[PDB]
Design goal:
Chain A: GO terms for molecular function: ATP binding; DNA binding; DNA ligase (ATP) activity; metal ion binding. The structure holds four protein chains of four kinds. Chain A is α+β, with helices and mostly antiparallel strands. In chain A, 36% of the residues lie in helices and 10% in strands. Chain A has a four-stranded antiparallel beta sheet with strand order 6-1-7-8. A four-stranded antiparallel beta sheet of chain A has the order 3-2-4-5. In chain D, 12% of the residues lie in helices and 40% in strands. Chain D is mainly beta. In chain D, the strands form three sheets. Chain D has a nine-stranded antiparallel beta sheet with strand order 6-2-3-4-18-17-16-10-14. Strand 8 of chain B pairs antiparallel with strand 13 of chain D, so a sheet runs across the interface. The structure holds adenosine monophosphate and manganese (II) ion (MN) (4 copies). The site of one manganese (II) ion (MN) has 3 residues of chain A, from loops. Chain A binds three DNA strands through helix 4.
Chain lengths: 439, 245, 252, 243
Amino acid sequence: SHMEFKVIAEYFDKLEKISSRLQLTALLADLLSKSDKTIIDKVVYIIQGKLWPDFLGYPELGIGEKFLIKAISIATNTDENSVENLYKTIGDLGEVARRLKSKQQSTGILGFLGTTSKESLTVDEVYSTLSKVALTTGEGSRDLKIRLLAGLLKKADPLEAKFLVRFVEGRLRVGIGDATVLDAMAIAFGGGQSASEIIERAYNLRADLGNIAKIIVEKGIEALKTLKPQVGIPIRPMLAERLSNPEEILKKMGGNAIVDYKYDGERAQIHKKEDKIFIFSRRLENITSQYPDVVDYVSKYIEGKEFIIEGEIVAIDPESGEMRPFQELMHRKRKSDIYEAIKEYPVNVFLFDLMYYEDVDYTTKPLEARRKLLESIVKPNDYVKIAHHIQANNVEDLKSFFYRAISEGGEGVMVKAIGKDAIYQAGARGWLWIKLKRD
Amino acid sequence: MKVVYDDVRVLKDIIQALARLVDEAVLKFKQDSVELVALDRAHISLISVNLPREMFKEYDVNDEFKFGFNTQYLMKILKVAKRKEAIEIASESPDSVIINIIGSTNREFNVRNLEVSEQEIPEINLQFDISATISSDGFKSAISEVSTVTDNVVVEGHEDRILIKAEGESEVEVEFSKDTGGLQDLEFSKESKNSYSAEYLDDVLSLTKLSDYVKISFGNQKPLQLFFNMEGGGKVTYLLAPKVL
Amino acid sequence: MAFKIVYPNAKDFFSFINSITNVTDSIILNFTEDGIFSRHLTEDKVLMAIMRIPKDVLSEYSIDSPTSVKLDVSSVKKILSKASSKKATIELTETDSGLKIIIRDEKSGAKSTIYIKAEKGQVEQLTEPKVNLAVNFTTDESVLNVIAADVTLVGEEMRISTEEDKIKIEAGEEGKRYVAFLMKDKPLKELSIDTSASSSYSAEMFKDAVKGLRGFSAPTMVSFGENLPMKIDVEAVSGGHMIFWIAPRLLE
Amino acid sequence: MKAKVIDAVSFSYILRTVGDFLSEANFIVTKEGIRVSGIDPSRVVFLDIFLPSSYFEGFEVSQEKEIIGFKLEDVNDILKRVLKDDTLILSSNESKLTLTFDGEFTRSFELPLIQVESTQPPSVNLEFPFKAQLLTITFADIIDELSDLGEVLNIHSKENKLYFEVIGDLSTAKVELSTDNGTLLEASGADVSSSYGMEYVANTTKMRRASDSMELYFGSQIPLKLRFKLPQEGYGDFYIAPR
DNA sequence: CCTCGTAGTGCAGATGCGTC
DNA sequence: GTCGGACTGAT
DNA sequence: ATCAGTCCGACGACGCATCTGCACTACGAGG
Ligand SMILES: *P(=O)(O)OC[C@H]1O[C@@H](n2cnc3c(N)ncnc32)[C@H](O)[C@@H]1O
Ligand SMILES: [Mn+2]
Ligand SMILES: [Mn+2]
Ligand SMILES: [Mn+2]
Ligand SMILES: [Mn+2]
C-alpha cells in the first residue's frame, strides 16, 4: 500500500551487469528482505513473468507485438510512422520507448480547466490494472485494452517505463529463473544455507509459488516436512537422459532392468476426487475442457477412490488399433465442434505410475510396491491398458525388443531403474531414467 | 429512491455513447435532477449528461444514491425492449438495485453495486472563435466520408464558409457555406486551422439522433467542443484535445 | 471550353463506374463527339464490357479537341460511395492536376469536390465486336440473380437450351443435377425465338456479370447464338447503355 | 412416395430446427404417417417428430416399408433456397430424392441416398406432477432474451406459479407467469424444482412459424417435456435431461 | 403501395498463441 | 525439446 | 596444467482463434 514500483526497477537496473551466479544471488535477497508483507505473493509472481500460475484456467493477456507501438505512439504524442521507423532499426522495443520520455511530454485536457497534481504509482494498483486488462472481454475490446494500458505508460518515469514493456512481452532477459529464486529465499528468510533442501522439497510438493511463500512467511521456516498432495495443485514431473547404445547403461545397472515403451504424443496427469475429472499436460494447463470425451473412461473403469495417476494420450487409427503421430492428434484439439470429428479420432490412454491413493504419501517408497498396487486397479478393455513391462538380460536381448518397438511405431524404447535408489524425484534430470532414440 | 421514465430509446444512445469511452460510471440522483460526469482513461475526452425533473412521471428521491455499474452489462440489459415500453428503477438498502421492465410480459433484474474511483474535475469555461450551428444529419455524412481514409482531420474556417478537408494522398473537401444548408451563425474573430484524430470522433456518432441542431465551436490552439439540446433543457458536451501539432 | 459535362443522376454514374470496376481497378476514359465512352478486357479474354452514353442526355457539353483521361480507381471507390438525394447533380471538369469531381446536394446543402492526378492524351475510335444472335428474351433483374445463385451448389458449367419453343437450363454432374424452365409469358414479359442452340458458358463469370447489374430498374435484354458469345443489355434510370460480352468455351 | 405441401416455409423451418442436434436422421414411411426419430450424441436430449396424413395433401403411397436417409447438411442447404410462399413436391426414387418447387418457374435438386440405421427409443411411461399451457409467441420472446446470461437454467414452480430463474455470480434474472396475467389456464399438479441446461433449450426456439400453442411438463430429478402443437393434430416433442 | 432505418447475418481481413 | 553456451567447480 | 555437474534464454514456421468492418436482406412505423 505504501510501496512504490521504483524500487523494483532500480534493483533490476543492476542486473544486466553481472555474469556470476554467485554474485547476483547475494543481491537478489535484499528486495525480499526489505519488501513489506501482504504483497509478497504479488512481488514473487512479478519476478518470474506471470500474473498467476497457469492451472487456474485464466485467460491469456491479449496485448501483442504491434499493439505496443500504437500504445507508445498514443502515450508519447508521436506519429505512428515515426515510432515505427525508429523501431525498425533497433530491435529492442525497450530502448525504442526509452528516450521518448525525456525529449517530449504531454498536456491533455486535465489542466485547461485548472488542475496540477501528480503522485508516484504503487505496485498494488499496477497489479490491479494488469488484472483488469487481462479480462476485458466485452465487444469493443481493442479500444478498451490499448487505452487502459496507456494509463500507466502516461503515469510512469523514464527508467521505470522500460521493463514494463518487457513485462508485457512476457520474457525478462535479466538473469533470474526459479531455482535461483528458491536458493535466494532460503538464504534470506531461512538464514541457513543448508536449509535450502527443505524449501526445494516444499516447492516440489506444490506447483504454485505464492502459496508456498505465504505459508513460509506465516507459520515460519518450519511446517514444511508434513505437506502432502491434495487433489488439486499438481507435482512437477521428472525428465530423462539420452545417450548412445554402448556397454554403459548395463554396466551402470549390472543385470536385468525394467523396460517400458516410449510412447509418442501428449502426456497426462490425472486428479480424480471421486466426483470430478482433472487432466493436465506436459506443463501446467487445464486441458479438461479440450478433452471431455475420456472423462468417463478414467472414471468408471478405474474403480476406487481419490487418486493421482500418470499416463500418456496418443491418437489411434479409427479403423483398428494402430499408432498415429502426435501431429495427427493436433488436428482435433482446437475446435469447439466436438461431436462431428471426435468420434473419428480414437484416444487410448496408458498408465505408467501412481502417486497418491491411500490417503498417505507414496513418492519415497521403492518402485515395485507402487507398480504392484497399481496393477490391481485396472479393468481390461480396449481403451485403458498398461505399459509393456518386460525384462531383458543383455544387449543381445534389447535389440530384439527394440526392433519390435520400431515395427510398432513410436519414438523407440526407454529404460528404468530398479532398487531402493529408484525414488520418484520431482524436477531435475537425474540418472535413474535413461532414454534412447533414433533420428 | 423511485425513478420512472417512459421511453428507453432516449436511454440507448446515451449509453452506447458512454460504452465506447470508459469502463465505469456513476449516476448521481439529487433533489433537482440527475447528473453524470465521466472522464476517459487517456484524459482526452469528457462527456456530461443531465436530465431534469420534468420528464419523470411524478417521482422523487429523498436523498443521494451513488449507483455504480459496468457499461457492457448495463447496455446488455437495455436491449430487452423493442417497442415503446416503460422502465422504473428503485431500491431500498444501499447495497442492491432493482430494475424492472413492464408493459409486456414483466421482467425484473437484481444488480449488485460495484465501487468506482473518480477524481475531481472543474467546470467548463472554454471560449472559442466560431459558433457554427450547422445541421445534424450532414455532420454524420461528412465524417463518415472524410475519416474513412485518413488518421487526422483538418477543420479550417473563414468569414463566409466552414471548410472540412483531408490531406495527403487524397484531398476531399466538404463545405457548409451560407449558400443553401450551411451556417446559421458565425463570429468573425480570426481564422483557425487545427487537426483531430479520426477515431475519437466515431464514438459520438450515435448521439446525433436526439435533435436537429448542433453547435460546433473551436479556435486556434484551442480544443473542440460540440453541443446538443433536447426537450427539458438537457445538456450534452464533448471536449476533445487537439493533436500534437 | 475543353472539358465540361454534366449528368443528372449520380446513382447511375456510380453504378456504371462500379460495373466497370468489377473487372479492373483502373479506368481509361475518352471524351469526344460521342460523349462518354470506356472499354476494358480481362487478361484471360473471357469477359468484355463496353459502356456508351449518347450525347443527348447530358445537360451540358463543351469540349475543344479529342483528349483522354486515364484514371486509377483505387481510393476513390469508397469516397464516391456517398451519393444521396437520388438524382444529385454531378458534373465533370478537367485540371492540370488531372480531374475534379463536383457533387451538389439539396438535402443538407453541402458540396463534395475531389482532386485526382491523371495525365491527358487522345481519344480512340469506337470498337465493338461483330456477331449475330437469334435466340433472345427480355426478363427482370432478380431472375438472373436467382439463376446465378442456384448454380453454385452443383458445379461450374452452365448450359442453355431452347428446344421446341421451350427454354431449359441444366448443369451440374451425374449425381447432383439442376433442372429449370422458362416458359412463354409465365415468368417473362416479351419473347422472340427463331432457333435453338447451346451456351456452355462459365459460372463465375456469370456471377460477376450479374453482380454488376443491380440498380437498373429496366427489363434486361438477353440474346445468344450457336457456339457464340453472350450479350447482356440494360437501360439506365436517366439514360444510357451498358452491354457486356460473355465469352464461350467452344467444345470444352 | 409422392407428397406436396402448399407451404414450403414452415416445413423448411421445422427441418432446420430438427437438424441442429443430430448429424444423420432417417425418414420412415408407414400406412398412415411419416416419422423422424433420433438421439443426440451427447446422450442428453431426445427428440421425435410425427406428421399426420393431412398436413401434406395429395399423399400417394407406393410401398409400405420405404426407409430413406439423408445427409443433414445437403437438405438444409438446398431448402435454404426458398423464395416465397411456394409449393414443394417430393418424390422418392429408388436411391435418390428430388425436391422441386412450384412458383414462377420449376426447380429440381437431386441428392443420393445414404445408408444409415440406428433406432434406440427410450420408453417414457411417465406421469409428470405438473401441467401448464401457454402461447408460443410468449415463450419464444421470453427465451430469446435470457439466453446470454449463463448456462444453468433453473426451473422453479409453486402453487399455480411457474417461475423462470437464471442466477449468475454477479447478478440474477427472474421471470413470472400467472394464470390471471399471461399463462392461459390449466395449471395443476404439485410443487417441485429442478435445473437444466441453456444452449439445448435455446436452440429449439426456432419454432415461431409452425406453432400455435405448446405444453410444459416437468418435475424433480425427472426429464422435462416440451410439446409443440402443429396444425391438424400434428405434434413434435423435445426431451431434455436433469443435471 | 411507397419511403426509411433498424437490425440481423454472412463474409473477407487482419494480429496473437502454443508447440517443439 | 534442443544444441549450444556459458558457469562452476575438484586434483 | 583439465573432464563432470547446473542452469538458461533463443527457434521461428505454422493451424487456429478472435474481433473489425462491409455488403445483402427481411421487416415494422408513417405519408
Ligand atoms: P519424447 O522425448 O518425445 O517425450 C518425452 C516424454 O515421454 C515420456 N515417456 C517416454 N517413454 C516413456 C515410458 N516408457 N513410460 C512413461 N513415460 C514415457 C516421458 O515422461 C517424457 O516426459
Ligand atoms: Mn499459459
Ligand atoms: Mn495479444
Ligand atoms: Mn505472447
Ligand atoms: Mn516426442
